[PDB]
Amino acid sequence: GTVNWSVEDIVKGINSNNLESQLQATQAARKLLSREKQPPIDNIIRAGLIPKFVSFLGKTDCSPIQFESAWALTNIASGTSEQTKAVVDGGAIPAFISLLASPHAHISEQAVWALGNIAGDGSAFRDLVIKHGAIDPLLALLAVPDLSTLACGYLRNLTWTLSNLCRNKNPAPPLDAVEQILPTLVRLLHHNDPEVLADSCWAISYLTDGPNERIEMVVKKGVVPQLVKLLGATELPIVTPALRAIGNIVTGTDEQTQKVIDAGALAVFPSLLTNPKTNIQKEATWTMSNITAGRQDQIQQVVNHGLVPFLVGVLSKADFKTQKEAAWAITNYTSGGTVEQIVYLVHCGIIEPLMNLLSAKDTKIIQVILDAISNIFQAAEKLGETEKLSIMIEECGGLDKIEALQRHENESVYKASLNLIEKYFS
Template sequence: MACTEARLSRFKNKFRDPAKLREKRIAMCVKLRKDQKNEHIMKRRKITLSSLPDEEISCASIEDIVRDVNSDCILLQIRGCQAARKLLSVERDSSINEIIIAGLLSRFVAFLSMEDEPTLQFEAAWALTNVTSGTSWHTKQVVDHGAVPAFIALLSSPMLHISEQAVWAIGNIAGDGPVYRDVLIACNAVPALLACISPDTPLGFLHNLAWTLSNLCRSKDPYLPGSVVQQMLPSLIMFLHLSDKNILSEACWAFSYLSDGENDRIEVVVRTGIIPRLIELLNHEDTYCTLSIVAPALRTVGNIVSGSDAQTQVVIDAGFLEVLPKLLRHSKSSVQKEAAWALSNIAAGPSKQIQQLINCGLFAPLVELLRSGDFKSQREAVWAVMNITIGGTVDQMIFLVRTGALEAIVHLLQVRDAKVVMVILDTINNLAAEKSGETEGLCRLIEELGGFAHIEMLQNHENVSVCKAASHLLDKCTEVSLISLRPLTNPNYIFLVASEHNSSFQTLNSDL
């Protein structure tokens, strides 16, 4: 079947060229592509600097702001910039537009270079930072007015609050995308940012630096240049070993971006030696309930196990499989989904790594997700089962069925998602393949579970590929004249037959 062949071309299995399979593995990952805005925001408007106390916000009119900013009096200029940044802190994009239309950006940028007036520098920098928190067009206006070199120069200011404000502005600009990220890199922003990191840097300031570096790592079209990654890695590794949860979160997000790509990018992260630390964070009781750390740490690990067999094994050897059952049963469905995705990546590997999944008892929580998880988690779990039937041995597939996976996916044939239904049909087809020697027993079990009733209905599905796949599967079972036979009275038939013809299955069970 053409549809099945197209799908199999995206997966790894022992019947295909091993040299090319792993390269395609990244394509089969059903990743969580939506940005988790509640945990990690690219831009920030309401700013609280670690070096300044909170203050009351009261807004002046735009007319008063324009008059004061354009005056020749330093005190009025300070008052105007302060009023502008307060207005921009509480109002929406319309206020940013008013500031831009009034021509105030050029004045703000000019104020950034007035080293003898640090208060004016700071207020102007804050106002510009709030402008960069708006749309891409707003950020463009700030960049086009020459603010980037001025902000980079402010990173070396002896005034901590001014330097920190510049960090925040650069973080907002970096978060806008690869174009302005590359502008920052061309202006040598990265060395200037890294120079701000020292043993004496306050934790709040370090958090802002970590967030900015993470934003620089975020965009991948194109990816961050390798030379820049190498510059940033020592600081990111250092951040990952601190105890502050905010800094840990930003560091984990940075590594999740850096590991999202081809095997050579993954290898750069693997060689840092951070994998044991990531597993530690996933397993630590304090961070287990901290979604802002668990989510990016798990995403990073999931990216790595989408790489080569060797890269996947490094993660396994670091103890990830011992932590994975807890993550599959996490209270947050988003974590369950990420964990199932990571498991599916490992399941796409060789039978040796699939056996390690079995040895760590991961089939049971996987089946739990298939039965009672939210649909997104179920979808990832279905892909994991599919991968096991592609690369697993006959014994491993039999054990998969024994844990209840077949029953669970048969019930999921009723979902409306055509892609999920196709994966399930292909999975059943793999289980019933001649190589297993269990076509008869499996078809009997499917009939006992009521699966053929669902498959027959799928012949009328609105999706043509689903119709063809359902018909093909029914034809296969009809060829062995099983559909019309009496119901299976012994659900363990398939396992009894397997044990008679394959003594290694007994060894497999005893090992478990």
């Protein structure tokens, strides 16, 4: 009946002065916009149908046309930024917010879905959805004694839309909007559905991707132990954002970093640093690099958890991006560590894989490794053991690599390599 209509027939039906003809034509548009291969979104926009669909959202007396027009508009809003703008320009934001209070669950859900797509476009539309007052009615849909009574798909859509209101920077979401959403987000983080847990973790990862004041708002809510629990989940869609959030928190203050260590996060790192997914190994090594950038007692916890051999591991063999993060973890450790901690790093076999990476065609990793070598030599100077280290670097072919770097195109590499040869290899 409403399958494979032309755009011309949809326009004729919607322009009729007959509500049932308009309903049939709107359903036909929804089905056209729902097809898997190339839905004619631009053709529907060019036919001037977005203002008609938006007016149909307000037809309280005809719930089927509210649903069909909400679905058609959600399909358009899910497209390119230009296509999402066409929906916003048609006045859809207040019309969708008014539908959040619909007594029909399938209509309310469609409005949740549409607002998530609009807010997900970027910072400006996210902030515009917030200004039109979407947060209060969205949170009211989750104000139930137990989240388990809500329909699974409905709860997943609400969580995803809330995550989009937490997403994007320049600027980050309004502080009061973040404070308003955070108690519901904390509750969703303790739910048992994997998709709700993944999107709640993504929301937390967005909120912690910023200055220390942004991280503090989250950490103050006591979510760090729950994030560490999810970091240990078997589902990769949960581990990925839980690791991102933990990684973001340790970019903060020493005290925020300490909350991560106190919650037992380091006990998961033997598996994360050997994870078969390269992005997990890479972001886990980045997280380690920010912990080794901490206090001497925090570097000591890395040592106590047996993680230095795991850092030697990723430096020895891993995807290059992970090896670069491992080089940063070592340079940070050698910058802030005690002589005893630096001695321990050498005893774990850091020298040979650190020297092997001086052959890489990446100036940034060369700079980071040369800084680590200088830091280790400074520790050896305090013990009068510079000769033992010089021979160690010589034996694994490290001297040949540092000598060749004296004629490198980069100024900082040239200077640092000439300095090491003149100070310890002459």
